[PDB]
């Protein structure tokens, strides 16, 4: 059912409203996703000036429905089965020895485009830390997103660790706690334990004058 909205290239739209340690900001993004390949290409722009935090801290926040689930795992794809009505995605993202983000998002189709609309609140960030200190390198590592079914909420939970490369050669962990809930009341797939294996490359648009990020990502379900 929901899965058939993803047999081809789908336009994507991202919108975020944020507040980190009281600094407010906005971001708009556009691109396309092709779940056949688990492939995503997105470009984001800070519509409110300079970004208060490093672009990479926001990658996970800015569409797991574009994950490639292999044939033998199609029945474990909660993300697509909740479409077109979509889901709510909430996270606590805790940065080791520093602040946290709490985020809330709706992911759903609006006409022929997949839209991800987010609210983010950050607190307790050290003014001289890796985040507000802008000490993260402009790149992104490759991770496993571990998914589990949450029958009580008719959805799923995920847990994972993002490794942010720090300019001084160290690594800043960001622990991700995640909950997804369908928006429609119809049937959804509740999957067995599995994970998503992700790889992301960050780059810049040479002709872009605004503060921005270009993201290329590949996501593939595995573990069954």
């Amino acid at each position, epitope marked *: 059912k929901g899965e058939e909205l993803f047999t081809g290239v789908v336009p994507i739209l991202v919108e975020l409203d944020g507040d980190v340690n009281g600094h407010k900001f906005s971001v708009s993004g556009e691109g396309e996703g092709d779940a056949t390949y688990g492939k995503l290409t997105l470009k984001f722009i800070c519509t409110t000036g300079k970004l208060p935090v490093p672009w990479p801290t926001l990658v996970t926040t800015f569409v797991q429905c574009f994950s490639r689930y292999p044939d033998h795992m199609k029945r474990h794809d909660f993300f697509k089965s909740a479409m077109p009505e979509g889901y709510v995605q909430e996270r606590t993202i805790s940065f080791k020895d520093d602040g946290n983000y709490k985020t809330r998002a709706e992911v759903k189709f609006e006409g022929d485009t997949l839209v991800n609309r987010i609210e983010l609140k950050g607190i307790d960030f050290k003014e001289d830390g890796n985040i507000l200190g802008h000490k993260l390198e402009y790149n992104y*590592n490759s991770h496993n997103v571990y998914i589990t079914a949450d029958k009580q909420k008719n959805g799923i939970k995920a847990n994972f660790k993002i490794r942010h490369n720090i300019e001084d*050669g160290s690594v800043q962990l960001a622990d991700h706690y995640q909950q997804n809930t369908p928006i429609g009341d119809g049937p959804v797939l509740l999957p067995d334990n599995h994970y998503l294996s992700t790889q992301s490359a960050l780059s810049k648009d040479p002709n872009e004058k605004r503060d921005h990020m270009v993201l290329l990502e590949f996501v593939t379900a595995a573990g069954i």
Partner: nanobody
Amino acid sequence: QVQLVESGGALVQPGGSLRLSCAASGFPVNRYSMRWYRQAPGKEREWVAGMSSAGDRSSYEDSVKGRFTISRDDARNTVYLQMNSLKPEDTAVYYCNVNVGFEYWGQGTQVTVS
């Protein structure tokens, strides 16, 4: 064409010293930060050490501070991990790491401290 290859792993007695090498191909070691991780069986793969791209800063995880030194020879495009005061707790497969568009790992080298 980006490749990393670790070497140097071996059996070593506690207290001993050992040096690991990470040979890099496909990119210049002096244009990218590089890192060592390790993974003991059972446990998760933890970050061990790193050096900035410019070379001006090095960092370590608390449990190896003052015992390990990371360095690099730019000309040989190689990164090293000098280990001293080896503890049996240091037993693990060691990996080096770089991000060049995407993240790359070497295949790892086994260090056994017994």
